[PDB]
Write a protein that binds this DNA or RNA. Structure first.
Ligand SMILES: [K+]
Ligand SMILES: [K+]
Ligand SMILES: [K+]
Ligand SMILES: [K+]
Ligand SMILES: [K+]
Ligand SMILES: [K+]
Ligand SMILES: [K+]
Ligand SMILES: [K+]
Ligand SMILES: [K+]
Ligand SMILES: [K+]
Ligand SMILES: [K+]
Ligand SMILES: [K+]
Ligand SMILES: [K+]
Ligand SMILES: [K+]
Ligand SMILES: [K+]
Ligand SMILES: [K+]
Ligand SMILES: [K+]
Ligand SMILES: [K+]
Ligand SMILES: [K+]
Ligand SMILES: [K+]
Ligand SMILES: [K+]
Ligand SMILES: [K+]
Ligand SMILES: [K+]
Ligand SMILES: [K+]
Ligand SMILES: [K+]
Ligand SMILES: [K+]
Ligand SMILES: [K+]
Ligand SMILES: [K+]
Ligand SMILES: [K+]
Ligand SMILES: [K+]
Ligand SMILES: [K+]
Ligand SMILES: [K+]
Ligand SMILES: [K+]
Ligand SMILES: [K+]
Ligand SMILES: [K+]
Ligand SMILES: [K+]
Ligand SMILES: [K+]
Ligand SMILES: [K+]
Ligand SMILES: [Mg+2]
Ligand SMILES: [Mg+2]
Ligand SMILES: [Mg+2]
Ligand SMILES: [Mg+2]
Ligand SMILES: [Mg+2]
Ligand SMILES: [Mg+2]
Ligand SMILES: [Mg+2]
Ligand SMILES: [Mg+2]
Ligand SMILES: [Mg+2]
Ligand SMILES: [Mg+2]
Ligand SMILES: [Mg+2]
Ligand SMILES: [Mg+2]
Ligand SMILES: [Mg+2]
Ligand SMILES: [Mg+2]
Ligand SMILES: [Mg+2]
Ligand SMILES: [Mg+2]
Ligand SMILES: [Mg+2]
Ligand SMILES: [Mg+2]
Ligand SMILES: [Mg+2]
Ligand SMILES: [Mg+2]
Ligand SMILES: [Mg+2]
Ligand SMILES: [Mg+2]
Ligand SMILES: [Mg+2]
Ligand SMILES: [Mg+2]
Ligand SMILES: [Mg+2]
Ligand SMILES: [Mg+2]
Ligand SMILES: [Mg+2]
Ligand SMILES: [Mg+2]
Ligand SMILES: [Mg+2]
Ligand SMILES: [Mg+2]
Ligand SMILES: [Mg+2]
Ligand SMILES: [Mg+2]
Ligand SMILES: [Mg+2]
Ligand SMILES: [Mg+2]
Ligand SMILES: [Mg+2]
Ligand SMILES: [Mg+2]
Ligand SMILES: [Mg+2]
Ligand SMILES: [Mg+2]
Ligand SMILES: [Mg+2]
Ligand SMILES: [Mg+2]
Ligand SMILES: [Mg+2]
Ligand SMILES: [Mg+2]
Ligand SMILES: [Mg+2]
Ligand SMILES: [Mg+2]
Ligand SMILES: [Mg+2]
Lengths: 44, 91, 274
RNA sequence: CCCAUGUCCAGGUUGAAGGUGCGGUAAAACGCACUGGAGGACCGAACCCACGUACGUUGAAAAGUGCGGGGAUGAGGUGUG
RNA sequence: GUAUGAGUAGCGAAAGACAGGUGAGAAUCCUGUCCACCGUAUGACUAAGGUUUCCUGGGGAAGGCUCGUCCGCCCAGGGUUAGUCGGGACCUAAGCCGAGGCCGAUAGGCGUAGGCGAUGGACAACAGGUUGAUAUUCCUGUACCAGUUGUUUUUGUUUGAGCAAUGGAGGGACGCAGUAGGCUAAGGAAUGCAUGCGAUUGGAAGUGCAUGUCCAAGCAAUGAGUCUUGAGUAGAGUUAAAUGCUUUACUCUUUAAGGACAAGUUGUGACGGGGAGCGAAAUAGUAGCGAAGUUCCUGACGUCACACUGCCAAGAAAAGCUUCUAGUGAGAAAACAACUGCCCGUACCGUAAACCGACACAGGUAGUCGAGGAGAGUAUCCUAAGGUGAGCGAGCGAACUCUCGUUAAGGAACUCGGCAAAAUGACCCCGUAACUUCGGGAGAAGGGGUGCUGACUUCGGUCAGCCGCAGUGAAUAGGCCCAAGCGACUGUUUAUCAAAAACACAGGUCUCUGCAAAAUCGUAAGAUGAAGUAUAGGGGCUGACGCCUGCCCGGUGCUGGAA
RNA sequence: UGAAAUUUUAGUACCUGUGAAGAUGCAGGUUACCCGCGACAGGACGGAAAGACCCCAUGGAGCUUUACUGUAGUUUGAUAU
């Protein structure tokens, strides 16, 4: 029974990282929304 | 950074005292200081001659008081070995 | 020739392959090798655009000289080599000036032949000449459609075309498909026919061999679901159950022509076939 | 599913093509030995899989375990990106 | 928020016993002894992941399915040392970003140059010791790599040593399978060597018992072997040039010669270190001391080395590196001495109680090492090194349920169905049918042998004898046959009720497609098809192979025609 | 050491009958001292899941086609370039 979550530092950053979010207009929209909501952590 | 700002404080512990017996002294240094800069700063400050400098990064350590939890500040530790025929650092 | 394996195993049963007798070496030319990746039928969007492709053995690209535009000096045929990229074999040839190149190996080519290219080259297997210089009735291959572009037509193993005549600035040609068309007289071609004629007769023998050759399984539309293929669905085996069989995207699959009706090349195609 | 680049498959068994020798013939085909080591080949661990059954079924487990079961140099398993 | 069920289910695979100690309190914590368990692992390393869980000293609120004096918990201190290891200051693959550029209601999409990007290439250090916690990082010893300064020694200074391209080249540079050979680890035996001991339960001072039985990198010398023809002439090229490289003809050489590689061995590294064991106080088995380190047997797909052979499915790139000139050039080279060498990771767990599973969860987790007897073996049983006794127990030994052993006579009468279980099972020998695509069927079937002790063996046997109910005496190992349907076959499939006759398949056939091909993704640009070209590519159907595949073109499609 | 599903309150018998037509609870009669423990599963139309069968809603979704109406594409003409 291999489960869905297989941790990996590099993959987390490459997929959900701050620079990845900033590379795309929609990723920047996510960052804006997180800031507006006030999330302490806006990116992985 | 200023040479005087490079070295922050000595480290006094069982391990560091044993090191002193071998004529190597442990100092907390600015986290951005490379061991070459550390060597220059030690020489200017203490007039001794440095044989080698071994540097290592101490990770921030998790702590908690009551309802609050955080991390101690990260540190940078440098073990400086003086040459023979050199004055000792007096603390 | 074709060697038939003894039926030692059901997989090996009925299998045949080539003996590679013509092949003289197995060490390609380092200078002419190029890297190739297996696109596996996926385009820049990453979507599968051509089904049933992918996997299989790794290959290196051999830079073939389809242009044959080096007319100054003669090229001596050094070796006949297997080419993983094409059905036909290739020939490594050394030009007397020291330039190494690969060409298609015509039927009857042999090590030591001194090929030449240019208008004055004699009509010998492996020579290259502009179509205007090739006498009628000659059998040729590696025909180029535009001058200087390099041979494009008649390159598969065992294929060949025949020169039928001249007219205006064009040359009448019967292609391997039986289609007769005009081709610009300044286009070049190689005298002869592409070697390795036996290629067609190989019996692959087992599924794993197709997988080696980079063919992934083909699934019949009749055994898909309705949302997958127009033939999909129905209880049990079903007939086509439509006006005509169609591709996965509804294009009729039997007899329905697809050539563009306003093709510019109709003016040059004299007699069609296929 | 695919791409690039790595990596894994204890140990046994069988004996294809080809080759050599001797027969045989005008030359052959062909025959007999030896050699040779092919295979989605055979048996079988690791590995992968999941056919039968019992149990489990507020479980040890939101799909498993026990006993057996199939594949195991390939259309193979698997890692990293 | 609190009840009921209820002091009920459950307390999550397995062996512990006792003595002593600690302490308010002990089945559960510590110590000791015996016993037991794993041992191709439940041992030893590592990558990811986790992120302080590591060490030391305290604590017993909560967490731990019981307990707890204890813990991966809580509290306080402490712990990760690199020119050489892995990464960066090196290279590139897939893929990604992308100056200009192309395309596009907006947003943006695509892409050249150029970059990024290891899982690959390149690249200089090892042995021992030391701490409670780090070690190829610290220390001792002995090195190497890049560079700076300086001393000395040679040689060159513009008829110019030397350096040297972003340029020309070479090289890097590569698959799979198959055995064979060399070498070394590894393993085993010895009345080899060294040390220690002589047993009390009847016997043994000997061929008794136990334990050990060797050491780098670097440097030097060599080396099992492995690959490879080597010159010369005349040309032609290599955007300029070249002595380099590529190459065409022509001579001579080719059992060789020359050249390029090479595991490993010997010496030194070593007056060093380890090492059975002996063993100190002032408080341990710890300072410290410390013998021997032979021969023989087996012997690695570990290494030479993808070396050789064979095969088809035809098996990265770039840099480093080596050469060539072009350019650049007044300084160079050697030895020696001293000196310089940055950032990041380094703790600990890691077939797990520390990772993925909500749990201290019978699941999952890449790679390396992985011993002995019997054995083909990493199977199997019992063991070595090493690790562990599983975080509720004490009784009792009812039904019933589960897991397992045995079972008179019968032997499928059970049942939807021989489901389950039983039976067969290893090796050696004899022997083996229909049918067949000649390969198989086939381990068909059906039989026989297996222990121990002598003798002789051509070393595999044979002959003789002995014992038992039984000799692959345990463990681990096919049940078989006749016949029919379906599917040719190996494969694939509904993760988690269906593994099949379903899908695929090789083969067949039809049809499209002349290349800016057809087809497909996309508004487009741009892509795949394909750096392919009708013996190719796409689509439909059928589905090995063998024998065959009849009649109908009126209707519907397609194709052609054009009055 | 210590849950859970369930649970209107319950001092919670049997027969025949009655009743929304299948009663522990209603009628007549019978039986039965109070409280438990170990077992079994006939009943509580037992628990679990606002039945998936069936029907209905001018509900939903996926699919088909010579259903209706559109439409991407493909093609043909005019016209501009
Ligand atoms: K948050
Ligand atoms: K076959
Ligand atoms: K080919
Ligand atoms: K098919
Ligand atoms: K169907
Ligand atoms: K099972
Ligand atoms: K409760
Ligand atoms: K209760
Ligand atoms: K404690
Ligand atoms: K490093
Ligand atoms: K790497
Ligand atoms: K040079
Ligand atoms: K070394
Ligand atoms: K040595
Ligand atoms: K470390
Ligand atoms: K053995
Ligand atoms: K073993
Ligand atoms: K316990
Ligand atoms: K009892
Ligand atoms: K029972
Ligand atoms: K019976
Ligand atoms: K049979
Ligand atoms: K017997
Ligand atoms: K067996
Ligand atoms: K089938
Ligand atoms: K089939
Ligand atoms: K059939
Ligand atoms: K099956
Ligand atoms: K299927
Ligand atoms: K057929
Ligand atoms: K077809
Ligand atoms: K059909
Ligand atoms: K087919
Ligand atoms: K008809
Ligand atoms: K018709
Ligand atoms: K009612
Ligand atoms: K009941
Ligand atoms: K639905
Ligand atoms: Mg460091
Ligand atoms: Mg296809
Ligand atoms: Mg279906
Ligand atoms: Mg449809
Ligand atoms: Mg249908
Ligand atoms: Mg039907
Ligand atoms: Mg097989
Ligand atoms: Mg696994
Ligand atoms: Mg599966
Ligand atoms: Mg099988
Ligand atoms: Mg098998
Ligand atoms: Mg109860
Ligand atoms: Mg337990
Ligand atoms: Mg085992
Ligand atoms: Mg601890
Ligand atoms: Mg503690
Ligand atoms: Mg407790
Ligand atoms: Mg490195
Ligand atoms: Mg882009
Ligand atoms: Mg731009
Ligand atoms: Mg290195
Ligand atoms: Mg440690
Ligand atoms: Mg005695
Ligand atoms: Mg030039
Ligand atoms: Mg070997
Ligand atoms: Mg460590
Ligand atoms: Mg676990
Ligand atoms: Mg055991
Ligand atoms: Mg019986
Ligand atoms: Mg009996
Ligand atoms: Mg019966
Ligand atoms: Mg019966
Ligand atoms: Mg059975
Ligand atoms: Mg046995
Ligand atoms: Mg089948
Ligand atoms: Mg199968
Ligand atoms: Mg299923
Ligand atoms: Mg199943
Ligand atoms: Mg079919
Ligand atoms: Mg009534
Ligand atoms: Mg009633
Ligand atoms: Mg009442
Ligand atoms: Mg009621
Ligand atoms: Mg109910
Ligand atoms: Mg309802």
């Amino acid at each position: 029974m291999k489960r869905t979550y297989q941790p990996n530092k590099r993959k987390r950053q490459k997929v959900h990282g701050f620079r990845k979010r900033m590379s795309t207009k929609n990723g920047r929209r996510v960052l804006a929304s997180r800031r507006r909501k006030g999330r302490k952590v806006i990116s992985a | 950074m200023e040479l005087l700002d490079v070295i922050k404080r000595p480290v006094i512990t069982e391990k560091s005292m044993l090191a002193m017996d071998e004529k190597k002294y442990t100092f907390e240094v600015d986290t951005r200081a490379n061991k070459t800069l550390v060597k220059q700063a030690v020489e200017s400050a203490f007039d001794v001659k440095v044989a080698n400098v071994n540097i290592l990064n101490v990770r921030p350590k998790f702590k908690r008081m009551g309802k609050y939890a955080g991390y101690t500040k990260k540190r940078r530790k440098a073990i400086v070995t003086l040459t023979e025929d050199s004055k000792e650092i007096q603390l | 020739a074709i060697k038939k394996y003894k039926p030692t195993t059901n997989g090996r049963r009925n299998m045949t392959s080539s003996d590679f007798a013509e092949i003289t070496t197995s060490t390609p030319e380092k200078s002419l090798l190029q890297p190739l990746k297996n696109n596996a039928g996926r385009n820049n969007n990453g979507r599968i655009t051509v089904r049933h492709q992918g996997g299989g053995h790794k290959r290196q690209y051999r830079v073939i000289d389809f242009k044959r535009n080096k007319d100054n000096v003669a090229a001596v045929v050094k070796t006949i080599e297997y080419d993983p990229n094409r059905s036909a074999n290739i020939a490594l040839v050394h030009y007397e000036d020291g330039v190494k190149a690969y060409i298609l190996a015509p039927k009857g080519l042999e090590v030591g032949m001194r090929l030449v290219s240019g208008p004055e080259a004699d009509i010998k297997v492996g020579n290259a000449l502009p179509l205007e210089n090739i006498p009628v009735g000659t059998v040729i291959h590696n025909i180029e459609m535009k001058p200087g572009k390099g041979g494009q037509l008649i390159r598969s193993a065992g294929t060949s075309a025949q020169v039928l005549g001249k007219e205006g600035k064009y040359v009448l040609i019967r292609l391997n498909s039986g289609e007769v068309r005009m081709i610009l007289a300044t286009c070049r071609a190689t005298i002869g026919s592409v070697g390795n004629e036996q290629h067609e007769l190989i019996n692959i023998g087992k599924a794993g061999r197709s997988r080696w050759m980079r063919k992934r399984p083909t699934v019949r539309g009749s055994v898909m679901n309705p949302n997958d293929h127009p033939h999909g669905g129905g209880e049990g085996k079903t007939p086509i159950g439509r006006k005509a069989p169609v591709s996965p995207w509804g294009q009729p699959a039997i007899g329905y022509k697809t050539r563009n009706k306003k093709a510019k090349s109709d003016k040059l195609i004299v007699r069609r076939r296929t």
